[PDB]
Amino acid sequence: KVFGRCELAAAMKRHGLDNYRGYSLGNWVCAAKFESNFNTQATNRNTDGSTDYGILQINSRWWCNDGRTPGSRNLCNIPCSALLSSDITASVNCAKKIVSDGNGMNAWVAWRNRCKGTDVQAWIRGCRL
Ligand SMILES: [Cl-]
Ligand SMILES: [Yb+3]
Ligand SMILES: [Yb+3]
Ligand SMILES: [Yb+3]
């Protein structure tokens, strides 16, 4: 599923991401835009042989099991395929663990490089929240 900007904002809010660990909703929407272009099916292979999955590009080295990443810790206790669902619940629940890991949203390189320090509230402008 390819989400609309406000559609995703609403879905993320419903699943408790607005101000989760102090990160306003716009941060999450901005991260999703540059990680996956709002596409739940996005996958990208990393240089270390791991793969990133879903709307928030969660990595198979640490967070989910894709059956081809030796030494995966599977800390979200889920198959990576579950992160490609049109239902974002699994992605959101796993992202909540990632952002609590100590480095906050810096865990997402696209957030650090493209969202951090910008006017992220723009990403929820015009939406019914
Ligand atoms: Cl933080
Ligand atoms: Yb990425
Ligand atoms: Yb990556
Ligand atoms: Yb409201």
UniProtKB/Swiss-Prot annotation:
InterPro entries: Glyco_hydro_22, Glyco_hydro_22_CS, Glyco_hydro_22_lys, Lysozyme-like_dom_sf
Keywords recorded for this protein, A-Z: Allergen, Antimicrobial, Bacteriolytic enzyme, Disulfide bond, Glycosidase, Hydrolase, Secreted, Signal
Residues of the C-type lysozyme domain: 1-129
Positions annotated to bind substrate: 101
One Pfam assignment: Lys
Location of the active site: 35, 52
Enzyme class at the top of the EC tree: hydrolase
GO cellular component entries: cytoplasm; endoplasmic reticulum; extracellular space
Oligomeric form and interacting partners: Monomer.
Record's miscellaneous remark: Lysozyme C is capable of both hydrolysis and transglycosylation; it also shows a slight esterase activity. It acts rapidly on both peptide-substituted and unsubstituted peptidoglycan, and slowly on chitin oligosaccharides.
Protein name per the record: Lysozyme C
Organism per entry: Gallus gallus (Chicken)
